[model samples]
Target: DSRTVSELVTNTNTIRVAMKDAYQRDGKYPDYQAPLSLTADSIKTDSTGIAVAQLVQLGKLTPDEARNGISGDYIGIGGAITSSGSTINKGFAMELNGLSQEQCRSILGQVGDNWEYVAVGTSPSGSYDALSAGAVNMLAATDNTTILRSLAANGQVSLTAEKILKTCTATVNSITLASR
Candidate 1:
């Protein structure tokens, strides 16, 4: 389903704030605005269609979910990287729908010794085991791009995190997840 202009703007703004916050936390201005701007353009153009479909394929959203609007609890995980010549920070926020905090915590707890699970994504039945896994993986990864690409390849909507830190950083030094 196609999102209305207002919906697109709201989503884009949410992403913008996240990106700006990350940059500010690392003592830098939100100079990397191109990603958000490009995202806005993508939403307005046909490029967004491809992304939306991919979201659906990944079970991130259904056609009706997109059309009617995203509701219910979702999880937002943020990360920061500070090393080498750059200090970068970013985040991965996604809708977890029915998954509870305890469930998420349980999934994360299981991430102990095994990092491969973090690369998982939603199952064909729409179960969020992979979402929790991806969140854990993103936090544990030393390289932001590695985690982003792993999640993307596993079929997840992670452009916000990827684009936010793409221009500036390395190593995942900090991460936090909260429900909303």
Candidate 2:
């Protein structure tokens, strides 16, 4: 089946619930240096997706629900606040890769309007540090010019039109959802 913004929201809710449960037990969110795994032929295979594997181990998500439904790739996890360099217990982030401009705006609006703070890049994780600096948190811009290169700053971030555009220009492009 093709990917849709509605499905994306459902998938995100599933992960968010699992994260809340996980956080309750572990006291901190999980971090993923790798993408989630796939149940079908995908650019990234199940073998390398240990981060997603952990979710199944915890009984939080099934293998089929692991993939983000785009490019057979999965979500990116961030539990630590990139800005503080210290692991955090109160915040977490999820990144959905391979989005079109429409899906980009849709997801950004959903997360910002309904969930929490969001951004344009892959670097944000927790509630502090470099995370806020990379926020595009809107269906929204800085220097539409600055959008040429995704913000690579650390210690703080926010969303800008430029941020989302630059990220949308590439395949690895995605929208980030970080807790408020």
Candidate 3:
């Protein structure tokens, strides 16, 4: 009966609103920095380390016979979907020290795209307005040919956002570090 709308959830939303208001006033997010060191053996692998050493890099799994006794591997398979910018068969394989097969598959499924851009405003509507209201017009103003040409020439449009985000892969293969 009481499971419908929890009071705790209401309180949490109130806290979120306060936090957002504070962030807007200060122009900062509340220490979004990750407490867990990305450099830790559990998170990232040192580019020049051996299998065991690489496993040590991803700090999530404990260093033991079941995990550290093996090696971590990353294999990427990159190819265009077609000759053009077709959907690519782009994906990679990763084997971490202690990650199960299911975990690996999950990681593969969750791959996404990351983008960096200089838009006019925070949101799409605001960004478009800001761009139009600026001293000089950017991108296409009207959906006409001239606007299209301007956008095509001097407009700073980055279509790279249409790609998938790359995730570093980790694979656990042989327990031995020696190359066979």
Candidate lDDT values, in order: 0.30, 0.51, 0.22
TM-score leader: 2
List the candidates' TM-scores in order. 0.26, 0.60, 0.17
The predictions' CA RMSDs to the true structure, in order, are 15.9, 7.8, 20.2
* Residues 29-138 of candidate 1: C-alpha lDDT, one tens digit per residue: 21111111222223334333232333334455443332212222122223322222333433333322232233322333332122221222222212233333322333
What candidate 1 gets wrong by more than 4 Å, as runs, is 4-13, 26-68, 78-120, 123-180
Instruction: List model 2 lDDT by residue over 1-180, tens digit each.
Output: 334567777778887787777667666555444553334444224555344556766678776566666544555665535333443434566667666656666666555444444555432222222232332322222233122222234313454454554444433345666552
**What is the C-alpha local distance difference test score of candidate 3?**
0.22
Ranking by lDDT: 2, 1, 3
Better of 1 and 3 by TM-score: 1
| Model 3 lowest lDDT segment of ten | 171-180
